Every structure is written in C-alpha cells, then in structure tokens.
Design a protein around this ligand. Structure first.
Ligand SMILES: *[C@@H]1O[C@H](CO)[C@@H](O[C@@H]2O[C@H](CO)[C@@H](O[C@@H]3O[C@H](CO)[C@@H](O)[C@H](O)[C@@H]3O)[C@H](O)[C@H]2NC(C)=O)[C@H](O)[C@H]1NC(C)=O
Ligand SMILES: *[C@@H]1O[C@H](CO)[C@@H](O)[C@H](O)[C@H]1NC(C)=O
Ligand SMILES: *[C@@H]1O[C@H](CO)[C@@H](O)[C@H](O)[C@H]1NC(C)=O
Ligand SMILES: *[C@@H]1O[C@H](CO)[C@@H](O)[C@H](O)[C@H]1NC(C)=O
Ligand SMILES: [Ca+2]
Ligand SMILES: [Ca+2]
Ligand SMILES: [Ca+2]
Ligand SMILES: [Ca+2]
Ligand SMILES: [Ca+2]
Ligand SMILES: [Ca+2]
Ligand SMILES: [Ca+2]
Ligand SMILES: [Ca+2]
Lengths: 397, 271, 271, 397
C-alpha cells in the first residue's frame, strides 16, 4: 500500500514535471524514479475487479525506459511519456477503486484486492518513493506504531441525534421542564426549557445539564460557543416520547446565566469555561458537559410580567440555550469532514458498482451509523479505504 | 417522576380516539330546568343512542341532573371519567358560578380546620379556605402578633368582618400572613383549608348563557381563558345537547384524563 | 397478547403488599344476620380502625350488607377492587349458593335474549343461560328440525319441562345443539345467554357454614377446589370477622388484580 | 512470536532428547539447532514484566555452545545442558506471562510485551525451528491468511442464558403458553409449555420455535439431539418477566411431535432434520432453529383425562422439550473448550498478578460476557493470548 502511494505520487510528479521545454535538471531524479518503477513493474500481470458490477480487467506492463540524453525536454519525449502515463494512471485508478470496495472483519489494515496484495510483495519494495501526504504519513506511523494525528475542519464527530428529555411531565404536557438537543456534524445545539419559568425552583434558578460523549478523543480543538440555540427558539409541535400525543413548545428566550462547559478526558476536568462565549479551546477531551441555568428575572416590565405568571396556564414557555461548533480539531483516528472528500469518494465508488453490503460497514456506509458504532475493526477498514481514496484523488478527480 | 427521554423523529402513532371512546366514560351534568324544558323522559336513552352513533358504547355515557348552580356547588362529586358540566348563566350568580368552576377545574389538596379552637393564617397565593354547606357565613377577624383583633374585638363576634353570607359554597381568600379568628356556623356549614395544585384536567365547564365572566384565578391581574371553559349560546336545551353530542370529539380532545394519585376512595363510574 | 421475554436469574422484587394496600380497596359482602347478631353499629367503624392496623387506610374498606344469599344472587354488583363474599351455608341452599359462587367467581360474557321471538341453542360447554329476577321459573321445550316439541307441545306451557321454579337466580345448562323455547315470566325475570371466559381474579368467597360443597364447574366430572373458594367454621360473626381481619393478607394474596377490557360501565369504589 | 514458539519447542526437545546415555545421532540436529539458538540469543538483553504485580526482571544471555564431539551423552553433558535449559525455560515463561497480561485494541495480532516485540525482529529469525502445533499452525495460516481451523470437543460457544417468553399471559399467571430455555456451554435445552394443553389451539397443535444465534459459524459439527429436556421437566416457581411476582408451573412431559431442526448459515437452510433424534451433523451453521409442537393426545386413559381438563383450573401444565449437545465442532475462530486449558491458563496468569482491567477484555475474562460480545478486536487478542498460552503450556504445565 505504501508502494501504491509511491505509484500515485510518481505518476502525479510525472504528469506535472515532464512537460514541453522543461530542463532535464528539473526532472532528472524523477526520471530515475520512473525508470526504476518501469523496470520493477515490467513482466507482471495484475487482475483488478470482480466484485459487484466493477468489471474484471487485466494489466500487463511492457514499457521501455525514458530517455536521459536530452538536455531540455522536447515534444516527442512528452508523447512517449504520456502514452505510458495514461496506461499507468488507469491501472492505479482501478487498483484503488477495487481496494475501496473490499472489507475484512479480521485484520482490516492488511491489503485486500489481490492486485494490491501482489503489489505488497517484496519485489515491488523498490518503488517506495515518498510518503508525504497526511494520510500516508499516518499509515506509515501506525505500521511504525506511534501517535497519529489527522487535522480536521468541521469534523462530524457527532452522530446525527435530535431528542429531548423531560424531568417534569404530565399527560397533558402543560407544565414541562427538561432539555432538547441536536448533535449533528460539528454542532451541539442544546436548549433547556421550563414552562413555569422557575417559580418553585430553588431561588428561582433551574439547573440544566447536558452530557455529550465523543466516540474518539479530539485534541487541540477550537470551539465556538454562543448562547441562544436557534433551532429550539421558535414555536414547535413535538411528538411525545412514546408517540401517543404531541405537545406544544412556545419559547421565550431568556439569557443562559452562569453557563459552564467542561471538557473531560477519561472523566477528569481537562478544561473549564464559565460565562466565556466566543472562541475557546479544548486541549484534549472525550466528553463535553454543558451546564447552564434558567434564572427567573426578579425585576420585570409589565410585558415580561404578563408573560410569566404565578398561575396555572403558562402560555409562554421559558428557555435558554447554547450552541457549540467544533471549528477544527485533531483526532487520532480518521473522520469525515466538511473539507476533505474521502468519505464521498469511497461512498461514490461503492454506489457506482453496487457493492453488496459487506461484513463490517453499515449499509450504504452512512456516517451516522458508522460513527455511532465505531469499533476498532471498523476504524481499521475506514483508515485503509480512506488512505486509498486519498491516494486515488491524487490522480483522479 | 423519573426522566422520560424521547426522540424527535418517532413516527406519529395511530389515532387513539377509538380506543379512548371504547375505554372511557363521558359524564354529563345538567340542570334540572334542562329536563323540565325537554318535557320528555326517553331523552336520556335517545341521547345515549345518539352518542353510540358517535362511538361511545351504549352505557358509557352517564347523565346526572342537579338542582341548580349553588346546590351543585355544595359538594361537587364527579362520579365518572370525563366530566362535562353544563352551566346556565343567569344574572347575580357570576361569583358563585365562578367559584364552582374554579373548584371543579383545579385540583385541591386540603384538610380540615377546627375553627372553634385555633387561629389560622394562609400559606400563600395558592392557599384558600373552602366553605361548603347549607348556609356558610364566614366571619373573620384579623389579629396582631400580640393576638389582639384589628377592626374587631376578639370576643365580640358582632364586630367580625363578614366576607360571605348564606352561600352554599365560598372560596374565601384573606390577607396571607395574618392570624385570622374565624366564626362559621358549625351546624350548617364546614370550612376546610385548601391548597391549589395543578389543573384538574378531567373536567370541562360549558357556560350556556351570556358573555365570558368566569375568572377561576382569584388574582385580579390574571384572567386566563382555558380550553376547558367552553361557552355556547342557547335558546333551547335540545339544541344545546345536540351541539354537545355532535362536537363531542372536540370536547373530549380538549379534555384530558386525570393524573393525580388520590389517597381517598370514592365511587367512580368506569369501564 | 405480545410476547414478554424474561430472564430466570433476576432478583426477587421487594414486597408489594404495602403498595397494593395503599393503592387498592377491599370490600366485604356479608348477610344482615351478621349485624343482627353483632347487635352493634359502631362495629363498621371499629373494624375499619382494626384494618388500619393491618395497613388498609381509613377509606379503603367498604362494608356492603346484603339481605341473604338468594336475594343477593339477583344481579350482584361488586363495587370494589378486592371483593370478599361471606356466604352462610344452610341445608337445601347448596345449589343456589353454588350458583352465586359460580356467577361471581367466573367471568361471563352475557348477551341479551329475546324469548318472545327466537328459539335459542347453546353453543358449547362454556355456554349457559343465566336468569335473574324476583322469581324466575324458566320452562324449556326442546324443538325438532321443523320446530315441533319433543316431550312437550310448543304452545302448551303446562307440558314444558321445568328446570327452575321461583328461584331468584338460575344458571340453566340444557343439551347443547338443540333449539329450545323458553317460558319465563317476562315481567319479573331477565334471562341472558352467557359464555364463561376465564376466572375472575377479583373476588373470593368465604363459605361460612358446612362441608366443601360448592361446585363451580357445571361439568359432573370435574369438581376442582379453587383457591378463591375459602371456607371456615363459625359460631359467632364477631369471630368470623376477626378471623378475616387477622388473615386479610392471606386472602388478598389469594385474590389478584382483575384483568379484562370490560365494555359495560358500572360504579366502582376505587381510590 | 513464531520465534517464541520455536524457542519453546527447542527447549522442550532439549529437556527430552538430551538425556543420559542416548546416542549422539539421535540429537545431532537438535544440538545444532540449540547451538544456533544460543549463538543468536547471545548478547541480547531483555526486559520482562512491569504490569500489575508481575515483577520487572532483566535477562542477559552469554552461554557456551553445547558440545558435539561426544558420541554418546553422559552426566556432564546433560547437566551443563540442564543448567542452560532451566534459565531459558524461565525466560520463556516470563515472556509468555508478559504477553498474556498485555493487551491492545488496534492491531491485536501484533506483539505487545517489548520483549516479544524485540524477538519479533529480524535478527532472531534464525531460531525458527518448526511450527507444528495446532495453535501455532493456525497462527501461521492467519499470518499467511488462509482458512484456519480449530477442532473443539464440546465447545462453549453459547453464552450462559436462562430465560423464557410467554406468548399468552395474564396477571394471575394461571393459564400460560410459551417457551423456556437454557443455553450454556455446549448445551441448548428448550422446553415449550402450554397450560391448556392445546385445548383451543387449531387442530389441538401448539407450535413452539426457538432460534439460537452463534457468534461464529461452526464447521462439521456433531450434535446429539434428544427429546424431553431435563431441566424444564420438574415443578418450579419462576419470577415473572417484570420481577414483580412469581408464577408456578408443574410440568407434564409429552412427546414432542414433528420436531424439526434447521441449521442455517446466513439465513440459508443448510441442513434440516425432521423427527430424527440421536446423533446428527451440520456442515456449517450460524443459527439453529428448533421447531416443535405440542399435540393434545387424541385418545386418553382416564388418568390423563383427569390430568388435563377442559375447564379452567389447569393444575398440571403440558410441556415438550429438546436437548442439544454440540459434541464436537470445527471453528475458524478460537473458542474455549472442555478439552483445552488455554482459557484457564490465561485467566489464572492474569489473576495471580492482579492485572488491571484492560480496554478490550471484560473484567475477569468471564467467558459468558466475552462471547456475548465477541468483536473482531476481542477475537484477535484472544487468539494471541491463547497461542501464547499454548506456547507456555508446552513447557510449564
Ligand atoms: C310462558 O308461559 C306463561 C304461562 O301462561 C305465559 O303467561 C301468559 O302471558 C300472557 C301475556 O302476558 C297472558 O295473556 C293474558 O290473557 C288474558 C286472557 O287469556 C288477558 O286477559 C290478558 O290481557 C293477557 O293477554 C296469559 O294469561 C299468561 N298465562 C297464564 C297462565 O297466566 C307467558 O307469557 C309465557 N312466556 C312468553 C314469553 O310468552
Ligand atoms: C391506523 O390508522 C388508520 C387510519 O387511516 C385506521 O384506519 C386504522 O384502523 C388504524 N389502525 C389501528 C390499529 O388503530
Ligand atoms: C358565632 O357567633 C354566634 C353569635 O355570637 C354564636 O352563636 C356562634 O356559636 C359563633 N360560632 C363560633 C364557631 O364561634
Ligand atoms: C428491598 O428489601 C431490601 C432488604 O430489606 C432493602 O435493603 C431494599 O432497600 C428494598 N428495596 C427498596 C426499593 O427499598
Ligand atoms: Ca357561592
Ligand atoms: Ca368590624
Ligand atoms: Ca390568600
Ligand atoms: Ca383573575
Ligand atoms: Ca312433558
Ligand atoms: Ca338457583
Ligand atoms: Ca350446555
Ligand atoms: Ca362439577
């Protein structure tokens, strides 16, 4: 697989650096690498595909070396090189495509795709050129076991989940209290609501808490924390917990007072921020505790006073909320983002040829069910296919 | 009550109207002048059949006559599962109608008072004294921290400040924080110290006469209108009953089943 | 009925006796001669106070006197949540006592019968006809395929075969699969075609007098002594009631919560 | 790790074949291999232990080669060899304990225990002697990935579970119908029961079915299927499903008629035995479906007639059972057995030194909770520690 990345890197370099009129000084070492690759790959027969609709293909290499006597590259050099290069690019594209469609419940990181398995052999270890991209670097580190780090922008570490909890409930759902939350992508929007607006609460302060568990421990993450969770700040009609009936939610957005966010790793306080909105930083964490308070305002103009009575009806329903974006982070294990197209590449290649549901991955490879149960075998297979997709994207877009 | 988590994407359940009409009882409470204007007496059975058309079982609808508003006000026992209270408005009965409506529409936790012996305060906004009987005449006398009356001699009942007389029912509120000495006519009325819990969602009061005058919230500032305080114009009691029967689905939807763990046994009319 | 899976290693739950005593009601049906011999009338209150020691709150116990067994047989309403029926045995009342025990102990699904129009069969083993009234004298005339009497003339009520006379309650089983014509005094007695479902867990019968004689199962072959048909000797009704009060835990342990989606509404004395 | 196995094998053969008076031709090759082991291990320092109470210990190797001139072994030769062999056996035992106790979640197959990580290097490949034991050869197959296979006598593949289901019920628990089963070790015992004895069931036939899902499909498995389940054929009182109350039942065992046993692999009926008891076989099966029926006896002696009445009471409750032993099987993955002390060895080594609970194995390595959830990472680590236990048990029984 390191050899596969070397193939992709050297083809990208060949396509970018073997151009009309470029000096041989610019491309001498690349030509040496390319000649070594040709010599190693000559006289082999690879077979690619055979799963789903992806068609079987046979690859045979008999290509001559590239010239070295030219001071400054001319046309004919470029056409000879290109007629070799399109063939090689097609081979590498098919190898990556066939690798991305295969799983393994046991020993995921080991190659699949008998073509790639053959490439892994000792014969082709002289292709190893360079391991520079982030994904191949982390692959090499894992084989060289030590800390791996993938930097992500808007990581979707949170599986999609919208739900509420009611700590005070009636069958008529007229005097409720509790929380609602959407964890989606890099967003945690949480909103604690009290229908009574903290009448009988201790000192007219109602404590709301929300616990979010990450499946992987993000590191050095910039987090944007704002008040007033928007999604839960307008009228809504919500099915009850058991679906029997539907209750009505008519927000009035109070300030969230003395908020307090704890970022925890293995259940110990790693970072804490009180009443500190805007850009904050989580050094290294595995869970987020958001604790805020709905404090009834003692002084009120008559409008607010009419909104919040001491009586039974409670026409308007007080609430507070927090929004928490993970703008960027660093994780030890591979994730989808809003920046890299690796998940899109793998899913597209699977759907194109209608790969049957495999042993390890969820059907359709949907990130919510993939991350909600993110076992080590799944992580191995995901890292393998994501590295392969990153390799493929070097040449094919 | 423990927490109850729920998802925001659960599919809406099938309608439970058929189940609830099959497993609940509808419970009409109408004045006697209704039946007198009807001038019939198969009409209960006929209305039961017309309810059966709407969906209730044959015996699931129970009709209860009452003499008039105050006579129902004394001891409202709601012997059944979804209570509708027809309530004909006539002038000068606004406050007693409101008192009755409040008492049946809210849940009360409440316990006796031995008037002849103690002095009683009121805990707060949600703590009234409910007097019921043949003829209640509360006569209160506020006291001081020194236990001497103000505006009234502690001994002379003649100086006590009457706050209701000759009412079958009286929901009396006094200043909350002052020890009050009470005189009430122990023979023909009894007074019990009561505190107001959440709404009694089991009942619904249908004002039959003129404009909205019910004010169940004793506070002057708030006069909320509740879904369970319905109002329908009338000239004929047959028309009233037919409207109720036709729109019973809306009424029972507006009403909800009770939710309160009672410590007392009583005669309910269930299925 | 959906399946309900359950492990075989879960730990036994705590005792629910206190929960059920706080949440349920007990009611005793006894004959008038009990009170007559007791020669008292503070005794209901005394027994309520006595039950309070065993843990039934003050309002939980309801004493519903009945005149005697044959007179109580006619349409017994069991206004309660745990029913005890003290049943004094006298010679020659064996069948009627057994009839009442069968009726209340077993769950019945009853349908009206129109004797004046239709000739009725019996569907099978579980079907009976129950006639209740001030004096039921059901006479049966079996019919042929052409609706002609056998052993009887269909129009001469005198030749009919009497199977009950002047009985307040009669549970008649006739030969299944044959149409019958019935003569029963339509003004006095009401007859219903009933099918025996499972048992009624709510009720227990304390036979007070003689030997083990109750036979709930009309089948001659089976005579099962069900757990809810308790029996005790007596000389003093005070001793009987003290026995019941002392051993109330065992009795309500024998009984169990009723389980049936009823359809006929009726008054219940629940908390 | 194969180096560790070869060390154990050559030390075992040194302890055995190097005995007084034996010919030198019997052990020429063994002595050459032992000398290779001595001269390739010489100069290497190893660090063992340092987890739990397992003590840290240092091993240094500087030993003299075994003699070869001797044409017939004597006391001096064998006692010098024993002096070397005792030290080597001590080192091997400590290394095996270390690798048993250590654990990993990603790449479980890889060696933990820095001593074994050092042994896995390239210098120590000259020790590779031969890989003949069933565990080591399955390990080499996995490394060279192919079809592995372990032969198990009475494999404990089922998690311990005793339970029941009531397809007909009521709060009095006086007229029930349903199933009640135990699955423990290698035994399935399922008993359907009906209190009415199919009084109202259509055609007086009550149907019972029970589907058991194995975590890994067993290959070429011999099974003993008998009727009349033992444990569910005597009167007993069981707490209800909720646990609120308890209910009695008094079995009356009946002939289970037209019993069918389907052995299924991926929901595909692979074998089907209909009313055949005794010993049966299954080629390959991931699920067992035991279907049986309770037929009310159409004719009845008066004793049984009084036993089963058409009325309600139902004082004796008809039952019909099935017992199913898995006498032997072949499994691709590793499992505990009644014939192998591998699980016992691993668990004992962890307990004796009080290893802290790891991230992958359950606390105490209880087989029930280890096979209830038998994820691939858990399987990988289990295979590693079991193979190390085999290597250790070659020497230290
Ligand atoms: C089952 O048998 C009894 C026994 O006869 C039936 O009682 C009969 O009931 C009818 C109608 O109530 C009585 O008819 C009366 O006839 C006299 C003259 O015959 C007339 O003056 C009355 O106005 C009335 O029409 C009849 O006398 C009475 N038989 C006896 C002996 O008293 C009973 O009706 C039968 N059951 C059914 C369902 O028909
Ligand atoms: C489900 O809802 C439909 C309404 O279209 C109704 O016809 C049907 O009877 C319902 N089913 C149940 C089980 O309530
Ligand atoms: C109230 O005052 C009247 C007149 O003094 C008296 O007859 C009556 O007993 C008093 N009641 C109480 C409860 O003090
Ligand atoms: C059940 O009984 C045990 C022993 O008396 C007691 O410790 C436990 O608290 C009880 N359960 C509850 C819920 O109180
Ligand atoms: Ca009044
Ligand atoms: Ca005065
Ligand atoms: Ca007040
Ligand atoms: Ca008001
Ligand atoms: Ca005759
Ligand atoms: Ca009788
Ligand atoms: Ca019959
Ligand atoms: Ca019998």
């Amino acid at each position: 697989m390191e050899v596969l990345y070397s193939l992709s890197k050297t083809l990208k370099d060949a396509r970018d650096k073997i151009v009309e009129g470029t000096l041989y000084s610019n491309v001498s070492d690349l030509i040496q690498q390319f000649n070594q690759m040709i010599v190693t790959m000559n006289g082999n027969d690879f077979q690619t595909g055979g799963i789903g609709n992806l068609p079987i293909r046979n690859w045979t290499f008999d290509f001559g070396l590239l010239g070295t006597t030219l001071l400054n590259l001319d046309a004919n050099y470029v056409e000879t090189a290109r007629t070799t290069i399109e063939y090689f690019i097609d081979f590498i594209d098919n190898v990556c495509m066939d690798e991305m469609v295969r799983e393994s419940q046991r020993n995921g990181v080991a190659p699949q795709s008998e073509a790639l398995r053959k490439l892994a052999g000792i014969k082709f270890k002289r292709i190893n050129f360079n391991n520079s991209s982030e994904y191949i670097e982390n692959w090499n580190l894992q084989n060289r076991r030590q800390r791996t780090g993938f930097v992500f922008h808007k990581p979707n570490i949170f599986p999609y989940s919208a739900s509420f909890t009611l700590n005070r409930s009636q069958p008529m759902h007229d005097n409720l209290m509790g929380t609602m939350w959407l964890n989606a992508g890099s967003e945690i929007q949480v909103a604690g609501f009290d229908y009574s607006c903290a009448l009988n609460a201790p000192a007219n302060i109602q404590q709301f808490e929300h616990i979010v568990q990450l499946r992987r421990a993000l590191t050095t993450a910039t987090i944007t924390l704002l008040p007033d969770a928007e999604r839960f700040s307008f009228p809504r009609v919500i099915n009850s917990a058991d679906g029997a009936t539907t209750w009505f939610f008519n927000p009035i957005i109070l300030r969230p007072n003395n908020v307090e966010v704890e970022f925890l790793l293995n259940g110990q306080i790693i970072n804490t921020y009180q009443a500190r909105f805007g850009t904050i930083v989580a050094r290294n964490f595995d869970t987020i505790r958001l604790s805020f308070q709905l404090m009834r305002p003692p002084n009120m103009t008559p409008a607010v006073n009419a909104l919040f009575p001491q009586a039974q009806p409670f026409q308007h329903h007080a609430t507070v909320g927090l929004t928490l974006r993970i703008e960027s982070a660093v994780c030890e294990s591979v994730l989808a983002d809003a920046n890299e197209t690796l998940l899109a590449n793998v899913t597209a290649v699977r759907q194109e040829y209608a790969i049957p549901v495999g042993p390890v991955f969820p059907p359709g490879m949907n990130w919510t069910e993939l991350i909600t149960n993110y076992s080590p075998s799944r992580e191995d297979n995901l890292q393998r296919v994501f590295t392969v997709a990153s390799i493929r994207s070097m040449l094919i877009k | 009550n423990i927490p109850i988590t729920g998802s925001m994407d659960t599919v809406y359940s099938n309608s439970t109207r058929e189940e609830v009409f099959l497993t609940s009882t509808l419970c009409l409470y109408y004045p006697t002048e209704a039946s007198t204007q009807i001038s019939d007496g198969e009409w209960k059975d006929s209305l039961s059949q017309m309810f059966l058309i709407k969906g209730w079982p044959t015996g699931s609808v129970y009709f209860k006559e009452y003499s008039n508003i105050v006579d129902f006000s004394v001891d409202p026992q709601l012997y059944c599962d979804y209570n509708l209270v027809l309530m004909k408005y006539d002038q000068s009965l606004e406050l007693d109608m409101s008192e009755l409506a409040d008492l049946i529409l809210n849940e009360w936790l409440c316990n006796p008072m031995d008037i002849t012996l103690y002095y009683y305060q009121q805990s707060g906004e949600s703590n009234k004294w409910i007097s019921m009987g043949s003829s209640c005449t509360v006569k209160v006398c506020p006291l001081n921290t020194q236990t001497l009356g103000i505006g009234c001699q502690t001994t002379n009942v003649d100086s006590f400040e009457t706050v209701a007389e000759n009412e079958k029912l009286a929901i009396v509120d006094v200043v909350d924080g002052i020890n009050h000495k009470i005189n009430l006519t122990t023979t023909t009325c009894t007074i019990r110290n009561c505190k107001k819990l959440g709404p009694r969602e089991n009942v619904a009061v249908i004002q039959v006469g003129g404009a909205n005058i019910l004010d169940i919230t004793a506070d002057p500032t708030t006069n909320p209108q509740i879904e369970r305080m319905m109002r329908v114009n009338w000239k004929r009691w047959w028309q009233v009953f037919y409207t109720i029967v036709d729109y019973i689905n809306q009424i029972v939807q507006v009403m909800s089943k009770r939710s309160r763990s009672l410590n007392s046994a009583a005669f309910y009319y269930r299925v």
